[PDB]
Write a structure and sequence with these properties.
The chain is α+β, with helices and mostly antiparallel strands. It has helices at 4-14, 20-31, 39-46, 50-59, 97-107, 155-161, 168-176, 189-205, and strands at residues 64-65, 71-74, 76-77, 83-87, 90-94, 111-116, 123-128, 133-137, 142-145, 164-165, 185-188. The protein has a single domain, classed as Beta-Lactamase (2-Layer Sandwich), CATH 3.30.450. α1 (4-14) crosses α8 and α3 (39-46) crosses α4. 34% of the residues are buried. Bound molecules: bromide ion. InterPro entries: MerB, MerB_HTH_dom, MerB_lyase_sf, WH_DNA-bd_sf.
Length: 208
């Protein structure tokens, strides 16, 4: 399918205020270590003052913190979701299914991703590396996408409706009982991975 509208809304969702895109990759890399991330650690990596880190995170109202005030979630999260994202010996999570396909290239690590089919509950798993996917179980795994025309922030709609499914037919049957739901589309996990690659290409071009 034509993916430009999906890429565009994802990119528009991240380039909110200066620095969000600039802080995103180092933050994802730190969260991938599986422990809460301090503002000061981020500040050191970016060579920013910590108050500037706080100012950019202040814009990202959906950022998750723990009881210590340290960062535990931004796309990749330490709090349990339906999308398990394992790096090394550390079990992390993601906010939506497409996130799990995007983050490996950004963090530069291979992840073992698992979930359950949103329509049937069947376990699904795959290995996602920066450049390819493998061990796609079951092989016909699908992903749902939405295109809220128009939300500035696609986070809420994707959290709600961007899942893994055991197959394209199962996903399309699920999608059929979402009559009227805006820009709802089903793709294979291969097509979704391609979307993420193209998103990542654009995102990374916008960094210095
Ligand atoms: Br288009």
């Amino acid at each position: 399918m034509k993916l430009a509208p999906y890429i565009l809304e994802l990119l528009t969702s991240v380039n909110r205020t200066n620095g969000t895109a600039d802080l995103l990759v180092p933050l994802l890399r730190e969260l991938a270590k599986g422990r809460p991330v301090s503002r000061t650690t981020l500040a050191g990596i970016l060579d920013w003052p910590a108050e500037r880190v706080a100012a950019v995170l202040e814009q990202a109202t959906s950022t998750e913190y723990d009881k210590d005030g340290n960062i535990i979630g931004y796309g990749l999260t330490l709090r349990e979701t339906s999308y398990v994202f394992e790096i090394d010996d550390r079990r992390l999570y993601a906010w939506c299914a497409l996130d799990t396909l995007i983050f490996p290239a950004l963090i530069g690590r291979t992840a073992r991703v698992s979930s359950h089919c949103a329509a049937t509950g069947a376990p699904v798993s795959l290995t996602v590396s920066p450049s390819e996917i493998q061990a796609v179980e079951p092989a016909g795994m699908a992903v749902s996408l939405v295109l809220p025309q128009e939300a500035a922030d696609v986070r809420q709609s994707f959290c709600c409706h961007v899942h893994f499914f055991a197959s394209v037919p199962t996903a399309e049957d699920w999608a059929s009982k979402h009559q009227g739901l805006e820009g709802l589309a089903i793709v294979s996990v291969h097509e979704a991975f391609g979307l993420g690659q193209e998103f990542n290409r654009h995102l990374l071009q916008t960094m210095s």
